[PDB]
Motif scaffolding. Structure first.
Motif: not given
Ligand SMILES: [Mg+2]
Ligand SMILES: [Mg+2]
Ligand SMILES: [Zn+2]
Lengths: 204, 175, 52, 163, 198, 190
Positions: E40-42, E38, E44
């Motif tokens: 990914r949500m920090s 996760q 791109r």
RNA sequence: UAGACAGCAGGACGGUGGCCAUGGAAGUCGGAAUCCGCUAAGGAGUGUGUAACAACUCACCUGCCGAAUCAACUAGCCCUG
């Protein structure tokens, strides 16, 4: 009523088949000699794996049926109901006599109890036809079957294409050139000798 | 066929002419055997399997011994084989060290009797090649590819025992 | 009735084993061949049945 | 269609996943893509016009393939309807929390998602449409005092509005 | 398998390291991949983030083509558990980012106690199952109509211990783990200029 | 096949001194001395360095099995050094449901008496192997300790107890009463 | 040597009860069957008890020691039978 098979294993006596001289015998326990999707064209099921013999002996109709069933069950459970076609390449034509001692040894000539099949070395007993991703399952199936027979057998893959008699590397080119025609579960070879009206019908 | 210490023989042969064909082809072979009376016989054995000839329909033109070219240089040999066991028939490949091609082949026929228990009439020999120090697929021979090699002679048994048969000195097995 | 960690330690030596089907033996739980000559190193095993 | 290019009966319902976002691979390059006459720019332009609020929420995907303008209604997000009433908008560039508001507060979306299903995956008076829309309490939520795994043996509403 | 996955990596990771100059390496401590998952949500693919295998011991093939310096200066830094996090962007900004870009950080036990421990002046959770958990340590357990309200302010744990089964089951089960960190910044790849993250 | 050589090595710390009369090893250190013979393996042992820093064991011309022994010698030596330098400590725990167990030590560290196992009236006595010293523990109720320098005698000693304390004619999957080893370890953590 | 193979350490989600069977099968004598993705990878899921579970667990990558290894066949002496 039935004896063991050590009493009738060796090819001792001459053939004594069922004819106008020998009457009064029952039928055999096997009646079906092939199973699976037995209609497939030559292209779907190109791979063939065989069971081969290594002795000169006699095999019984019971053995053949038992082997037939064990292979079908596993082969279904592995691949599918239609992922293969199986064929048996032996027939029980020879007959067995029994002398029942309920006189003694007077008037000895038996009664036709049984049927059995003879084997030579190099002959074939069983064969399967299927696809190439299912190779090891084919081997596993036959291996379960050898434990139903009295002898030493072995397994091998064939270079041929299916149940035909042509080498795989040649077949595929040779059908795209109008020497081989797929007429059913088999093929039909044709040479350059007949009358040309059959060369007119083809190439058109 | 039995065996002693073997030898290599070069035998070359031909069919017999006829009003059809005048000069048939020759055929050569390289054979290992004790002497020349048996090698002629092994020749007709093989050439009959391959082609269609026999002894009455042919002649032996030359049979002779071929001598080693460098018999004082250690060499690595590789041998291709066909034999048949009690169950089937098999092929294989084996490697050895010797000075002479004859001696290496001889060294095989013993080895096969020991590991696999094959009598000489159950063996066919196809090809023999002088292999480099590389290309040796077998470890027993690669142990010896060392420029600085050494080892001792550990526990060394008394030979010559029955020279004195009754003694007082118990022996020594350290040297 | 009993502390769980001690209970695990006991079960180690009395419940976590494999069993040859022939010789009816005890074997370490990571085994594939028997140890005895009475059976021939037979390669046919099961696990031991835990209480219900 | 078999003999030659004859477009007679081709309307088909296929399945894709990876979510309906603009992506780097775009999630719009399946194997069924190149069969259907879709160039790469328009096939995303329709998808992002179709993915307007109601619903921007990531579902796996579904696509009833038509020729040019292909609608994609909200699929059967049933593990994701645990969360797909997230306080909108949340499209891109503001997603530091994966799915972590924990503010679904199951009061109405349980039965409203239960009826919203098109009589799908059930042989019951909506009992399964409750069950499989509850199969995914992994990262779920409940009432401010209620926790999953110790509330799942009670029902307190009327089954008269089920279908 | 490992056929087409690595057939990419015959040249894929080679290509990454050649054409695109500046990078970071992130060390992975004893961590579950939730952070690597996760992340990914920090961010791109502003550049990319991809932790792989220890192919960073295969660098003779990489300096074979004479691509970029500061490449070979990592073999001691990779003995096991390290990745690679690629950014060609503003230095001090991403420094500050991966100083503490490690959110999920779940692990039952094994990690360190990084800071000083304080009074637990909050309601972590009450259990009427058994009170021996409190009676064993012997702290104020005044019962005022069922509930239990603590007011004592005293020191219990201090930095530089080794975690045990008691506080391990504590920090798993009661929804508190000030215990684990995910994946830290430790190196600098300035296309060839090696300096520290100060 | 056969192979020409196989060898393996062991280091020694400075605190320790060892010597050899061929295949007879002598170790000495802080916690005393040990002596053990390897006259049944047929290897060559040598000892080289400044004040005999390092040991190697090697063998010439051996089969598959005969090579398997070379590491086994080395493993024993590591154990002996560790014991004379640190010493071995094994801990053991008791388990019961209804009838507890009463263990006492009659000599200093030699003779053990186990009493009331499963509510019996019979008494079990055990004799430690020589050198080993047993003593009940502290900070946990039901716990023993065995200190020694020779792992062999310790492990042999602890297992006598474990088999003496065992139940018969029942289902052991439920009846799980006995003295079972907890953990191995050392007298010193260093 | 791109660090596998043995062992230690984070696992096995969604459209999805795919779908027959409901007397029981949200993997669950078991049979035609066996698409899609989330990652870095979770199989229309491997025995276990089973109203059914949640899950135990039987591919997939984050590290320690570490490499020349792995699998399936075959035949000679010895062994069980
Ligand atoms: Mg007769
Ligand atoms: Mg039944
Ligand atoms: Zn056994």
């Amino acid at each position: 009523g039935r004896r063991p098979a050590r009493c009738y294993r060796y090819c001792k006596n001459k053939p004594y088949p069922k004819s106008r001289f020998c009457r009064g015998v029952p039928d055999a326990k096997i009646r079906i000699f092939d199973l699976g999707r037995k209609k497939a064209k030559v292209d779907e099921f190109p791979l063939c794996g065989h069971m081969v013999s290594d002795e000169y002996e006699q095999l019984s109709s019971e053995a053949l049926e038992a082997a037939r069933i064990c292979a079908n069950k596993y082969m279904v459970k592995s691949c599918g109901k239609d992922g293969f076609h199986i064929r048996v390449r032996l027939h029980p034509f020879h007959v067995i006599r029994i002398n029942k001692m309920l006189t003694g040894m007077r008037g000895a000539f038996g009664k036709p109890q049984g049927t059995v099949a003879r084997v030579h070395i190099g002959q074939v007993i069983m064969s399967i036809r299927t696809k190439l991703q299912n190779k090891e399952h084919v081997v596993e199936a036959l291996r379960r079957a050898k434990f139903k027979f009295p002898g030493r057998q072995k397994i091998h893959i064939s270079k041929k294409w299916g149940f035909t008699k042509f080498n795989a590397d040649e077949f595929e080119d040779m059908v795209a050139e109008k020497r081989l025609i797929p007429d059913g579960c088999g093929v039909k070879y044709i040479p350059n000798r007949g009358p040309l009206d059959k060369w007119r019908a083809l190439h058109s | 066929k039995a065996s002693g210490t073997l030898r290599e023989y070069k035998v070359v042969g031909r069919c017999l002419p006829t009003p059809k064909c005048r000069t048939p082809p020759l055929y050569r072979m390289r054979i290992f055997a004790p002497n020349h009376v048996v090698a002629k016989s092994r020749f007709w054995y093989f050439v009959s399997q391959l082609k269609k000839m026999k002894k009455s329909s042919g002649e032996i033109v030359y049979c002779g011994q071929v001598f080693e070219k460098s018999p004082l240089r250690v060499k690595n040999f590789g041998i291709w084989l066909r034999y048949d066991s009690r169950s089937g028939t098999h092929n294989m490949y084996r490697e050895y060290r010797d000075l002479t091609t004859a001696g290496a082949v001889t060294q095989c026929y013993r080895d096969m009797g020991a590991r696999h228990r094959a009598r000489a009439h159950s063996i066919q020999i196809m090809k023999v090649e002088e292999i480099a120090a590389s290309k040796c697929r077998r470890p027993a021979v690669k142990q010896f590819h060392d420029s600085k090699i050494k080892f001792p002679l550990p526990h060394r048994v008394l030979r010559r025992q029955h020279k004195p048969r009754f003694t007082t000195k118990r022996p020594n097995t350290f040297f | 009735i009993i502390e769980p960690s001690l209970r695990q330690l006991a079960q180690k030596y009395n419940c976590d084993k494999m069993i040859c089907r022939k010789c009816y033996a005890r074997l370490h739980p990571r085994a594939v061949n028997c140890r005895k000559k009475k059976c021939g190193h037979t390669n046919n095993l099961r696990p031991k049945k835990k209480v219900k | 269609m078999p003999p030659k290019f004859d477009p007679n009966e081709i309307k088909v319902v296929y399945l894709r996943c990876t979510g309906g976002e603009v992506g780097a691979t775009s999630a719009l390059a399946p194997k069924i893509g190149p069969l259907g006459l879709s160039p790469k720019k328009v096939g995303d332009d329709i998808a992002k016009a179709t993915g307007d609020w109601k619903g921007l929420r990531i579902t796996v995907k579904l696509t009833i393939q038509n020729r040019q303008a292909q609608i994609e209604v909200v699929p059967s997000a049933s593990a994701l309807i645990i969360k797909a009433l997230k306080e909108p908008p949340r499209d891109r560039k503001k997603q530091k929390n994966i799915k972590h508001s924990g503010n679904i507060t199951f009061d109405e979306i349980v039965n409203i998602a239960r009826q919203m299903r098109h009589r799908s995956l059930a042989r019951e008076l909506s009992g399964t449409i409750k069950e499989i829309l509850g199969t995914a309490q992994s990262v779920g939520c409940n009432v401010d005092g209620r926790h999953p795994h110790d509330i799942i043996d009670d029902i307190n509403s009327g089954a008269v509005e089920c279908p | 398998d490992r056929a087409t996955w690595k057939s990419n990596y015959f040249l894929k990771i080679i290509q990454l390291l050649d054409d695109y100059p500046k990078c970071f390496i992130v060390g992975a401590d004893n961590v579950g991949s939730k952070q690597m998952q996760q992340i990914r949500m920090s961010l791109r693919g502003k550049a990319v983030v991809l932790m792989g295998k220890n192919t960073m011991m295969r660098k003779a093939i990489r300096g074979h083509l004479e691509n970029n310096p500061a490449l070979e200066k990592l073999l001691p830094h990779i003995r096991g558990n390290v990745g690679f996090v690629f950014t060609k962007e503003d230095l001090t900004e991403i420094r500050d980012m991966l100083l503490a870009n490690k959110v999920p950080a779940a692990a039952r036990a094994g990690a360190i106690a990084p800071c000083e421990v304080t009074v637990p002046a909050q309601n972590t959770g009450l259990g009427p199952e058994k009170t021996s958990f409190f009676q064993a340590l012997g702290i104020t357990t005044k019962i005022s109509r069922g509930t239990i309200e603590i007011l004592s302010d005293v020191q219990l744990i201090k930095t530089g211990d080794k975690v045990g089964a008691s506080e391990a089951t504590l920090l798993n089960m009661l929804n508190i783990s000030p215990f684990s960190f995910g994946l830290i910044i430790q190196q600098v790849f300035d296309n060839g200029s090696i300096y520290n993250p100060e | 096949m056969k192979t020409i050589l196989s060898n393996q090595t062991v280091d020694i710390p400075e605190n320790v001194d060892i010597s050899l009369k061929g295949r007879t090893v002598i170790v000495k250190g802080p916690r005393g001395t040990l002596r053990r013979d390897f006259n049944h393996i047929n290897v060559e042992l040598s000892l080289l360095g400044k004040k005999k820093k390092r040991l190697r064991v090697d063998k010439w011309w051996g089969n598959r099995k005969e090579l398997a022994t070379v590491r086994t010698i080395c493993s024993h030596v590591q154990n002996m050094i560790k014991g004379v330098t640190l010493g071995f400590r094994y801990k053991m725990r008791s388990v019961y449901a209804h009838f507890p167990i009463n263990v006492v030590i009659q000599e200093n560290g030699s003779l053990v008496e186990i009493r009331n196992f499963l509510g019996e009236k019979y008494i079990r006595r055990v004799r430690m192997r020589p050198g080993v010293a047993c003593s009940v523990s502290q900070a946990q109720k039901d716990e023993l300790v065995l200190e020694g320098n020779d792992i062999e005698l310790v492990s042999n000693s602890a297992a006598l107890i474990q088999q003496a304390t065992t139940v018969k004619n029942k289902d052991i999957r439920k009846f799980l009463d006995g003295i079972y080893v907890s953990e191995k370890g050392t007298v010193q953590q260093a």
